[PDB]
Amino acid sequence: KPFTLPILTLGELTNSRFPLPIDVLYTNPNESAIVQCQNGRCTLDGELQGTTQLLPTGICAFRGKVTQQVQDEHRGTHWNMTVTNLNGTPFDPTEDVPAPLGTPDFSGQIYGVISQRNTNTVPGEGNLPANRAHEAVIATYSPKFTPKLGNIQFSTWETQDVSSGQPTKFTPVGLASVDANSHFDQWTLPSYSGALTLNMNLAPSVAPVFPGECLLFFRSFIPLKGGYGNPAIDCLMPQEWVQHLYQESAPSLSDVALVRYVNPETGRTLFEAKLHRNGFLTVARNSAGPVVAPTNGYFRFDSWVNQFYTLAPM
């Protein structure tokens, strides 16, 4: 079965690591961190890895139940919530994944909304349940961030109106802050089972091997609740590619696919890239920053090549 990519253009793609549109292609050759994100991880023959799942709505989402308000040294009102799988089934800590699928894969203060729809109903309200929603922040670097253990902590500005024991949804919106104390680092993994514990079942790190090549990312700018900053989240492949590869399950015929970024209006190749078996791109570029190209561009699969192939410089 022939390998293919979707023909979605850049303006028709979304980020696999946060629910955002793709804004720009981006490189950063001098990156010192190990790149080992756990969302948006899928091999070219369709094997999901890390905490990757298929739903755009599941990325950095949680589902579970608040248990109680809990004490924390930091500003705001804090709440513990048990988390299930996103489909509502209990999370089994013995499954070979790093954390429930969809769990955030970076250090930071994730801003969003916690909502609740009670289980118990009121006969006088037409047998309908009570609801509430409030802004919330999940500090994924917190020692109380233990999604692999089945529970996480979030904070609210709201001091009282979060109910114990009720079905709870976290909808991610952006970051609370990127100030010095907010520990935003997109390449630092949370400790999924808590402070001082080793993460397990991780999708592998990715890196260029060939001289003069660097990783190519699909970058999205992420909203901020407050403060100064222009934070971005870089993914290895957009969510649509994860969905496409998963569907197709086409055998990989070598370790490296040649892809060309094409202008569909002019028919011209703007540059070429290696699409590696483990699900990431490299290009021959010697600079950091955006790739300035029209957002109607798209990657076209050309052929299977190998580690010895020399890319034309971008």
Ligand X SMILES: C[C@@H]1O[C@H](O)[C@@H](O)[C@H](O)[C@@H]1O
Residues that bind ligand X (CB under 6 A): 130-132, 134-135, 157, 161, 226-228
Shortest Å distance, C-beta 165 to ligand X = 13
Using CB under 8 A, which of 45, 240, 255, 302 touches a second copy? 240
Q: Does 76 bind a second copy (CB under 8 A)?
A: no
Shortest Å distance, C-beta 190 to a second copy = 23
C-beta closer to ligand X: residue 15 or 177: 177
Shortest Å distance, C-beta 208 to a second copy = 29
Q: What angle do CA 56, 87, 128 make, to 5 degrees?
A: 105
Using CB under 8 A, which of 50, 58, 190, 297 touches a second copy? 58
Neighbours of 9 (CB within 10 A): 17
Burial track 276-314 (b if 16+ CB lie within 10 A, e otherwise): bebbbbbbbbeeeeebeeeeebbbbbeebbeeeeebeeb
Shortest Å distance, C-beta 113 to ligand X = 10
Please say whether the beta carbons of 156 and 116 come within 8 A.
no
Question: What letter represents residue 304's amino acid?
Answer: W
Tell me which residue of 290, 300, 238 sits closest to 267, measured CA to CA. Answer: 300
Please say whether the beta carbons of 17 and 105 come within 8 A.
yes
Q: Does 131 bind a second copy (CB under 8 A)?
A: yes
Binding site partner of 157, from ligand X, a second copy, none, Cβ cut-off 5-8 A by kind: ligand X
User: 3-class SS at 243?
Assistant: helix
Using CB under 8 A, which of 67, 84, 188, 243 touches a second copy? 243
Please say whether the beta carbons of 288 and 29 come within 8 A.
yes
Residue numbers at the binding site for a second copy (CB under 8 A): 6-8, 11-14, 19-21, 54-58, 86-87, 111, 113, 115, 117, 122, 125-126, 128-133, 135, 169, 171, 173-174, 221, 223-230, 239-240, 243, 247, 295
